[PDB]
Swiss-Prot record, chain B:
The modification Phosphoserine is found at S17. Belongs to the bacterial ribosomal protein bL34 family. This is Large ribosomal subunit protein bL34m. It is found in: Mitochondrion. The gene is MRPL34. Disulfide bonds: none annotated. Component of the mitochondrial large ribosomal subunit (mt-LSU). Mature mammalian 55S mitochondrial ribosomes consist of a small (28S) and a large (39S) subunit. The 28S small subunit contains a 12S ribosomal RNA (12S mt-rRNA) and 30 different proteins. The 39S large subunit contains a 16S rRNA (16S mt-rRNA), a copy of mitochondrial valine transfer RNA (mt-tRNA(Val)), which plays an integral structural role, and 52 different proteins. The chain holds residues 55 to 92 of 92 of the full protein.
From Swiss-Prot, chain C:
This is Large ribosomal subunit protein uL2m. Belongs to the universal ribosomal protein uL2 family. Component of the mitochondrial large ribosomal subunit (mt-LSU). Mature mammalian 55S mitochondrial ribosomes consist of a small (28S) and a large (39S) subunit. The 28S small subunit contains a 12S ribosomal RNA (12S mt-rRNA) and 30 different proteins. The 39S large subunit contains a 16S rRNA (16S mt-rRNA), a copy of mitochondrial valine transfer RNA (mt-tRNA(Val)), which plays an integral structural role, and 52 different proteins. One of its GO terms (molecular function) is RNA binding. The chain holds residues 61 to 254 of 305 of the full protein. One of its GO terms (cellular component) is mitochondrion. It comes from Homo sapiens. It is found in: Mitochondrion.
UniProtKB/Swiss-Prot annotation, chain D:
It comes from Homo sapiens. Keywords: Mitochondrion, Ribonucleoprotein, Ribosomal protein, Transit peptide. This is Large ribosomal subunit protein mL37. Component of the mitochondrial large ribosomal subunit (mt-LSU). Mature mammalian 55S mitochondrial ribosomes consist of a small (28S) and a large (39S) subunit. The 28S small subunit contains a 12S ribosomal RNA (12S mt-rRNA) and 30 different proteins. The 39S large subunit contains a 16S rRNA (16S mt-rRNA), a copy of mitochondrial valine transfer RNA (mt-tRNA(Val)), which plays an integral structural role, and 52 different proteins. mL37 forms a heterodimer with mL65. The lineage of its organism: Eukaryota, Metazoa, Chordata, Craniata, Vertebrata. The gene is MRPL37. One of its GO terms (molecular function) is RNA binding.
From Swiss-Prot, chain E:
Belongs to the bacterial ribosomal protein bL28 family. It comes from the Eukaryota. GO terms for biological process: mitochondrial translation; translation. One of its GO terms (cellular component) is mitochondrion. The keyword Methyltransferase does not apply. Component of the mitochondrial large ribosomal subunit (mt-LSU). Mature mammalian 55S mitochondrial ribosomes consist of a small (28S) and a large (39S) subunit. The 28S small subunit contains a 12S ribosomal RNA (12S mt-rRNA) and 30 different proteins. The 39S large subunit contains a 16S rRNA (16S mt-rRNA), a copy of mitochondrial valine transfer RNA (mt-tRNA(Val)), which plays an integral structural role, and 52 different proteins. Interacts with OXA1L. This is Large ribosomal subunit protein bL28m. One of its GO terms (molecular function) is RNA binding. Keywords: Mitochondrion, Ribonucleoprotein, Ribosomal protein, Transit peptide. It is found in: Mitochondrion. The lineage of its organism: Eukaryota, Metazoa, Chordata, Craniata, Vertebrata. Potentially represents an important therapeutic reagent for HLA-A24 patients. This antigen is recognized by tumor-infiltrating lymphocyte (TIL) 1290 in the context of HLA-A24. Its main location: mitochondrion. The keyword Transit peptide applies.
Length: 101, 38, 175, 371, 158, 176
RNA sequence: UUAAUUUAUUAAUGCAAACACCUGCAUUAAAAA
RNA sequence: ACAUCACCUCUAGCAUCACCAGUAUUAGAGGC
RNA sequence: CCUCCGCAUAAGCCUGCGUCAGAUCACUGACAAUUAACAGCCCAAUAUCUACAAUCAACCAACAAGUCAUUA
RNA sequence: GCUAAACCUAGCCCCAAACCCACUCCACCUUACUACCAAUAAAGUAUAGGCGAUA
């Protein structure tokens, strides 16, 4: 979940569970050549690699073998009529290598 | 140019460290500056 | 400013200390007569190495007694393997001391060269400390000794303050 | 705040708020104790309620303790005679030409050159890099003799082996905790070297004692200790008898390295500890004279300067200052090559200079003991 | 903190002067609080002590502006609370002396509520008040249960 | 599997996909917490598909087939969040009487302004929290002048606004 | 700086107060206006 | 150039924040 | 035909000659991308150990006297 | 005839009246925006003052 406080964990405490996940995901077409088992996602900044693995495995029943992440920097080189910089937002790209060939 | 040096001398923490820096920040907040510190 | 002095170690240590050409600091024990834990009275000590010290003009001696090593300041003829008595007992007669041992000023033949002189009983040795220096025990009155510092200013100290005999090592540091 | 002095009233503090305020009194807080145990924030009890805090302070000699005068402390601490030079028995194992590797000198030379020059991508291999390799390669050369002596199939070279041994001398309690690499283990024990006459003649010997420094200096004061004799293995372990302790000084910096005297004292104490653990395991914790004294040897090395020790442990009544005494044979400052040039100087080609093969012959003799 | 003229002549320079009192580390005994207090005072403090006949009377007589001390008002608040509470902890197992001292200062007897707020700086009073009215919010469950019970009572009487 | 990220292949390139009304809050109030749970995940999948399609349309330089249903899914999920949140706060008011889920306080920072400080979760209590005790929840007397000047700045802005409204009303009455 | 007069101070003294530190009142200098 | 080794001059008989964790063959203040 | 330059990292800068499209000696809009093993980001306490330079470290060669470690 | 000219209304000013602001979620004193550990008049009068400039 995004934009929420997480309950603090202490030793021998209950598992943290999220019941209605708040972060949403898109699978986008790669801009370059990729291996056959690689699926590319655009992902929220807060969502981690473990979170993405569990997300796909649970919601979509996709067996995931590897996950990699990078943060893409959006351009700040473009201006209003007021010479004020306009930001294209940064985003997170995930690369998911599927399992079982 | 150095980011460590810049944030060490003109940063938020350095400003709030002393009453004079708090007054700098208060002056800038009264003026309406977008950037109160480095 | 952000000045934190390096002079921050609490416990006495035989090892050099990184201090702020580069030098490391050897901690000198100027309280020459200190009995160690669960010991008292006079005690012998052995010279292991007579070492150059960057922090000062005289050279120093790593000197081990019982269960503790310590850095003391060297006298002119002090060899590796030499044995030195750190004494406390003020004798009835004078003590015909050797070149490098430390005695209360009541236990010395008057008119001998001394060095590393205290100012109070238990003060620690503040004076006659640089290279090749020496001071002569001029005369003593009841519970009192009078010293001639190398600046020829005489000093009245108590009888039971410890001073080491002989002159400080590394002579011809001047020349 | 003076309000804390007035017998009637309770000071008003910023404890109601959860922050400091300069115009309200500072609250007094109870000593907070975390309810649960969390390993990353554990505070050990002060050194009184540890389950083993003995008032009688023990002295520990670990792998680090550099002795003051050196060997003398070792003989005194162990009550052992010191005879210069190895016995005739061991040196006679290599007296013949038949007990020799083919191209012996050249083979040893190649091991040296590998260790010091041909080892790594780096131009000049460093001490940590060439000391243990010289050791292990020498044991490999020696192990190349299994053809002539099949009994060498009954020995192994185990590492990360730690032994412990406790003994009393006068009123001082000593405990050795040997943690060093390359301990050689044999199924068969080493036969006694010292016969009856030498041990029975050692009685007249008096061990020389020094002053003023106590013969306990630079050993570790330790009050939280256990009087436990650990031979370094579980019971019913094959190859249970120590043969040779290979100890190496592999520090680059000169101060970080043991002086040769201190290293010899190191090996004396280590061999004694190994033998003492074996004695206590085989005979119980009884201070007595052994009818089957235990012989254990050690090889100490700096990387090029070798030293050999053979220790004969024959008494367990260490507390007394008289009676039979242990005895150790030492070969000291046995450098195996004078120097090694890694770059040609312009005159002197790359390689070792001053190679003397007698040092390795002694090495081979020690290795072949018990074979 | 003032200024003076160099030699008591107005045709001289004006130069800054500070006049400091003489501080004496004296030691007194508050009978009503029954405590030895070490206090830094002035000779004038000893004079008003003498004229007021005791530290007790001096403290409960001298007003806030004349005392000009926070410690003085802490002592005052303690004293007035001890009077108002009729507190037996002055001298345990000693009632006649307690009664003697308590009657000795009957004049300055005050209600306890008034004594509670005496000598408090404004921030201290706000802190006390905010403690006082700090209550855990009562759950709507019992409000609604009581309301339902009340409605059932009203319906029953119909 | 991964086909759920794209809608039925029969609709690919249709340029107009028919969709029904979005869930209202009132409709969702009649459903159980479990029906709300599963409906949440249904809408999660649907929104992921629609976001995927929107991005792919941007990539192909083509208009999205029917962008209204994305808004409808978003509105449906906001309604579901509102419904569940209402239930949670009703229960919290009943059991505890508190109005907010996160504990907080009315504090006064270094700049002298009243703020609602929201509390965080910590393991150690506050008096031995080194970092927390560096923060200053009080203002020194050098702030009150700046507080007064800010007050006057706000007063100026309000006066300008109210006067401008009155002038505009005069103009409106003049024209009409 | 040996212009003006002064010592706010800092270092000393002397005298008051108190039972040495702290304070008040004068004097002599350095650094000062 | 200053600093700094080195050199010269003057002051200083001494301890816990520099000098200094130093003690007149020394240290500081200057100058080059 | 030049090459006294280049290639990486650091520091700094922040998408600043990738693709598609347009305008402007002859930048704008849209889309896309940098995937950790390299490097950051560390360390459970309480005491208690840390005299012997580097220079191929072996002599020699010295002074300005040195850059390094644990145990219970 | 090029360059250009022209335009009213954004808003603002001075008053009056009235005592203002400040938690969607989340983040922010560490390198901020970082989940988590030791009236008028009296009157320019009386007065003060290198008794003067002035007050």
């Amino acid at each position: 979940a995004r934009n929420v406080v997480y309950p603090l964990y202490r030793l021998g405490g209950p598992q943290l569970r999220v019941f209605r996940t708040n972060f949403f995901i898109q699978l986008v077409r790669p801009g370059v050549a990729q291996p056959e088992d690689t699926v590319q996602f655009r992902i929220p900044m807060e969502m981690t690699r473990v979170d993405l693995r569990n997300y796909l495995e649970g919601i979509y029943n996709v067996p995931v073998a590897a996950v990699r992440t990078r943060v893409q920097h959006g351009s700040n080189k473009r201006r209003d009529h007021r010479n004020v910089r306009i930001k294209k937002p940064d985003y997170k790209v995930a690369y998911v290598q599927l399992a079982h060939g | 140019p150095s980011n460590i040096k810049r944030k060490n001398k003109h940063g938020w923490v350095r400003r709030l460290s002393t009453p004079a820096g708090v007054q700098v920040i208060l002056r800038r907040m009264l003026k309406g500056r977008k950037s109160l510190s480095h | 400013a952000n000045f934190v002095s390096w002079k921050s170690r609490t416990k006495y240590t035989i090892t050099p200390v990184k201090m702020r050409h580069k030098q490391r600091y050897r901690m000198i024990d100027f309280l020459r007569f200190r009995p160690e834990e669960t010991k008292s009275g006079p005690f012998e000590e052995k010279v292991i190495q007579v070492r150059y010290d960057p922090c000062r003009s005289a050279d120093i001696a790593l000197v081990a007694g019982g269960s503790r090593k310590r850095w003391i300041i060297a006298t002119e003829n002090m060899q590796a393997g030499d044995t030195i008595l750190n004494s406390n007992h003020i004798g009835r007669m004078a003590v015909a001391a050797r070149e490098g041992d430390a005695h209360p000023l009541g236990a010395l033949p008057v008119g001998t060269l001394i060095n590393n002189v205290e100012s109070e009983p238990g003060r620690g040795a503040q004076y006659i400390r640089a290279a090749g220096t020496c001071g002569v025990l001029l005369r003593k009155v009841n519970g009192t000794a009078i010293i001639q510092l190398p600046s020829k200013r005489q000093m009245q100290v108590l009888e039971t303050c410890v001073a080491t005999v002989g002159r400080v090592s590394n002579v011809d540091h001047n020349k | 705040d003076r309000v804390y002095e007035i017998p009637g009233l309770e000071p008003i503090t910023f404890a109601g708020k959860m922050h400091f305020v300069p115009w309200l009194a500072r609250p007094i807080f109870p000593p907070w104790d975390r309810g649960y145990k969390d390993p990353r924030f554990y505070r050990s009890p002060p050194l009184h309620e540890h389950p083993l805090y003995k008032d009688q302070a023990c002295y520990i000699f670990h792998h680090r303790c550099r002795l003051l005068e050196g060997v003398k402390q070792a003989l005194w601490l162990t009550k052992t005679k010191l005879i210069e030079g190895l016995p005739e028995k061991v040196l006679s194992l290599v007296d013949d030409p038949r007990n020799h590797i083919e191209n012996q000198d050249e083979c040893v030379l190649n091991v040296i050159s590998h260790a010091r020059l041909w080892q790594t991508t780096e131009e000049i291999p460093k001490r940590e890099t060439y000391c243990p390799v010289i050791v292990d390669n020498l044991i490999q050369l020696c192990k190349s003799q299994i053809l002539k002596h099949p009994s060498l199939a009954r020995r192994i070279c185990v590492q990360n082996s730690t032994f412990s041994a406790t003994w009393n001398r006068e009123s001082l309690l000593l405990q050795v905790r040997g943690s060093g690499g390359a301990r050689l283990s044999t199924k068969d024990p080493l036969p006694t070297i010292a016969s009856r006459e030498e041990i029975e003649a050692t009685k007249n010997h008096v061990l020389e004692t020094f002053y003023p420094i106590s013969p306990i200096i630079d050993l570790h004061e330790c009050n939280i200790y256990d009087v436990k004799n650990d031979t370094g293995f579980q019971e019913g372990y094959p190859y249970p008898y120590p043969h040779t302790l290979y100890l190496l000084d592999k520090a680059n910096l000169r101060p970080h390295r043991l002086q040769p005297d201190q290293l010899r004292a190191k090996m004396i104490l280590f061999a004694f500890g190994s033998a003492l653990a074996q004695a206590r395991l085989l005979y119980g914790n009884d201070a007595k004279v052994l009818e089957q004294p235990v012989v254990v040897q050690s090889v100490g090395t700096d990387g090029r300067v070798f030293h050999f020790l053979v220790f004969q442990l024959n008494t367990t009544d260490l507390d007394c200052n008289e009676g039979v005494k242990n005895l150790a044979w030492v070969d000291s400052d046995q450098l195996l090559y004078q120097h090694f040039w890694c770059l040609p100087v312009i005159v002197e080609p790359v390689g070792p200079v001053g190679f003397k093969p007698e040092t390795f012959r002694k090495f081979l003799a020690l290795y072949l003991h018990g074979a | 903190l003032g200024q003076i003229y160099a030699n008591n002549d107005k045709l001289s320079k004006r130069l800054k002067k500070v006049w400091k009192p003489q501080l004496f580390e004296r030691e007194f005994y508050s009978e009503i609080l029954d405590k030895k207090f070490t206090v830094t005072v002035t000779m004038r403090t000893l004079d008003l002590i003498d004229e007021a006949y005791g530290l007790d009377f001096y403290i409960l007589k001298t007003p806030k502006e004349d005392l000009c001390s926070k410690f003085g008002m802490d002592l005052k608040r303690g004293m007035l609370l001890r009077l108002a509470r009729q507190d037996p902890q002055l001298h345990p197992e000693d009632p006649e002396r307690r009664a003697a001292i308590y009657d000795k200062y009957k004049e300055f007897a005050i209600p306890e509520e008034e004594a509670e707020w005496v000598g408090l700086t404004l921030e201290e009073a706000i802190e006390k008040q905010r403690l006082l009215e700090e209550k855990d919010p009562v759950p709507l469950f019992k409000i609604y249960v009581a309301e339902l019970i009340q409605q059932l009572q009203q319906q029953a009487l119909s | 599997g991964l086909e759920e990220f794209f809608d039925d292949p029969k609709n690919w390139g249709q340029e107009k996909v028919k969709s029904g009304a979005a869930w209202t809050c009132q409709q969702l109030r009649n459903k159980s917490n479990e029906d709300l749970h599963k409906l949440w995940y249904v809408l999660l999948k649907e929104r992921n598909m629609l976001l995927t399609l929107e991005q792919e349309a941007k990539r192909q330089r083509l208009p999205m087939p029917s962008p209204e249903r994305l808004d409808k899914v978003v509105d449906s999920m906001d309604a579901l969040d509102k419904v569940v949140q209402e239930r949670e706060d009703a229960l919290r008011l009943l059991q505890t009487g508190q109005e907010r889920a996160r504990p907080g306080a009315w504090r006064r920072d270094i700049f002298g302004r009243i703020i609602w400080h929201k509390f965080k979760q910590w393991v150690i209590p506050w008096h031995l929290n080194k970092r927390y005790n560096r923060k200053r929840f009080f203002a020194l007397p050098y702030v009150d002048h700046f507080l007064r000047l800010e007050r006057e700045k706000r007063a100026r802005i309000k006066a300008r606004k109210e006067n401008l409204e009155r002038k505009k009303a005069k103009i409106l009455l003049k024209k009409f």
